[PDB]
Amino acid sequence: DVVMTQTPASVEAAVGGTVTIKCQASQSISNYFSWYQQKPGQPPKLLIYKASTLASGVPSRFKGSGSGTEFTLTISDLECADAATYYCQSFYGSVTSDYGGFAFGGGTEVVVKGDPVAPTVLIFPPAADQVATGTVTIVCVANKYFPDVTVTWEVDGTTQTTGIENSKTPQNSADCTYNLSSTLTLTSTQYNSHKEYTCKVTQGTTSVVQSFNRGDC
Amino acid sequence: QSLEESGGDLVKPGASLTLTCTASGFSFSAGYDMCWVRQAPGKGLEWIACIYADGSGSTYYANWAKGRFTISLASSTTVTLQMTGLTAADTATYFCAREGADGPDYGYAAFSLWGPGTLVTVSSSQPKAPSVFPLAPCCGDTPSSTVTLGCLVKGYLPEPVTVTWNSGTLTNGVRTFPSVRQSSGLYSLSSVVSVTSSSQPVTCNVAHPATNTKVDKTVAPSTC
The missing domain is CATH 2.60.40.10 (Immunoglobulins)
Known part of the structure; x- marks a missing residue:
């Protein structure tokens, strides 16, 4: 089992600012690398697959780069609607055997800060x-x-x-x-x-x- | 195309439970796997196993699940997960997902299509049904043009409960809060809504599937 070390646990950024999440694999994986978004109480939503290609209906300000063991997700032009937890994910081993599996990062919680209000x-x-x-x-x-x-x-x-x-x-x-x-x-x-x-x-x-x-x- | 997992329940420790994924709008064929991924309450995503939907292909498990869990095709539209020796670590929401593909030959090892989740709660307790109390401002508070009313759903087990307002005709400015689990093991949650003071009462519709409980509480704006 690969270990997917995702950094950071939580990031906070203004509306319209940009953010870069990172995953490093403890072992080598395949170029089949993906990234998900998960708002509370909902299932994940595939953002990126094969490291950089966007899923159906993901605007371009979601951007994924990387190779080998380090991979990036970069969200720019941030909106409130982007506030969610974000998970990376890899595949290791042979697609031609029952050896090898999938590994998920531990998630990054993105906090989009707007103008400070009082409750x-x-x-x-x-x-x-x-x-x-x-x-x-x-x-x-x-x-x-x-x-x-x-x-x-x-x-x-x-x-x-x-x-x-x-x-x-x-x-x-x-x-x-x-x-x-x-x-x-x-x-x-x-x-x-x-x-x-x-x-x-x-x-x-x-x-x-x-x-x-x-x-x- | 759609997924839907069923079968989650409250099980006793060391028991065994069978989950089922059911596909709609498509049927199984060559080119992709069907997989199970769980998520403990407030934790990350943990992969369990996969099976190639036409069967001929393989069936790969996370190292930690080999031996206890088992994955099977029960039909052209249902995939199952057998779980044995359930600890409380196995308490989680159990998701079901379709490996996506960008071409006809094989997947791209990412999960595009996901079900909503079925929730396994492993506990030494019996199902308790919630008690529901209206939430309404102090009688002595001078009223206003709007008011925030709500419902307190207290002391249920297992999850989930559903809270709907005036039978689903009301959703604007409704806040339903995440459930908290008290030290007792019993969950609670509140849900409020903000309406104009028509004097017309609102009603909350609470459901706890695990006890076949449906209770309907009308919340007067509590002016004594």
Whole structure:
């Protein structure tokens, strides 16, 4: 089994800028080298095959060069819609035997940066039939933000530490902006033992905060 | 031309599972291989095996899969993957793909046509069906011309769940978030939508195929 060492793990580049991804094979492969694009929740999409030839419907700003063990993918004129993870791939061994296989790089996540926006933040107090089950889940949403945020929960000013999960949508294909959902889960005994609930979305020096008092909703 | 993998399920550790790829708009012939590639949640792409679709050709496996996995042609339109001794490393989305060719003789060792994936979840647990709660702003928040409502789908296993809004007539400004897996092994996910305040209620349609669960929650703009 060949090892496909793909560099880098993540790259970040402005709209209209250019980017060059690299794969180096630990062993020698064939000129049959390809490159894929994979947006979240979707199957891959073949971009290039035989090292440099484009797949059906790939604009020319996708460019692949290389030979031997190093190969390149170069995306220029970058758009938000290009934000995806990108995989290289090779074939080794003999096509005339059951010896030899295919190897994929470990992927490059391309982050197209647009003009920095700050998230509008919504907080959803747990529905009335949640508390009856013995566990409540407060949900919080950050919309239309760039760049990445970090989320803090404050139960009456005490920064929570546990029972927190986070989920980020893909970069929007138009304005490049993320979205984010953060859930704080507590016992019902906990939740009815405190009044204020706070969701602190932080973007470097900036912070947008959304709150609600339990007796208010 | 089209692919479609079925058969993914929740299996217990050390069990065995059979996936199936089904072709549409074409049938198998000489010139290309049919292959399986998996992808662990949040991981890269891992090749499993291939088979030359007219059978006479070879059948090559990734070194790590030889012995456990097996690949077969079950018909002119279905290809199968037998999986034995499933660990939790084998938990992944399992894709099926067609080797492309630029000419009639043989492939070009890249996969042009891909199915959507079937999801194998290897776990010591039983399928749990989600609970669904409306997501709606505080009653005490003074309303506005639009509002963001949504649904919390909490505590399901295995994946996936589907969230559709007002039975699919609504998609503008719908955000459905990736699922997170809590420490319990149970997945959760939220999905919101942004509508004008017609006062008309919206309804979310949650489905969990693995428990034959379909539940329909109407989300009032929660003004008490």
